[PDB]
């Protein structure tokens, strides 16, 4: 209903604060988005 759109309210970020981090740890990010006239 209110898509994340920088330029509408500064840079935005997705945040994860991990309690435990093993070797070769990583975040696999998946996005769904529109990219209109602009």
Partner 1 sequence: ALINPQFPYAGPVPIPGPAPTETMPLLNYRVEGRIAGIQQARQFMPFLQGPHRAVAEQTYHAIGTGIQMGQTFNQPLINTQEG
Q: Which residues bind to partner 1, rule: CB under 8 A? A: 6-10
Closest CB to partner 1 among residues 6, 22: 6
Q: Of the two residues 9 and 34, which places its CB atom closer to partner 1 in the complex?
A: 9
Q: Which 8-state DSSP code applies to residue 32?
A: -
Taking the complex as a whole, the smallest distance from the CB of residue 1 to partner 1 amounts, in Å, to 18
Task: Indicate the residue among 26 and 37 with the shorter CB distance to partner 1.
Answer: 37
> Which residues are CB-contacts of 4 (< 8 A; sequence separation ≥ 6)?
12
| CA separation for the pair 19, 12 (Å, rounded) | 23
């Amino acid at each position: 209903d209110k898509p994340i759109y920088t330029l509408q309210y500064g840079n935005v970020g997705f945040v994860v604060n991990p309690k435990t981090v093993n070797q070769n740890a990583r975040l696999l990010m998946g996005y769904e988005y529109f990219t209109s006239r602009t």
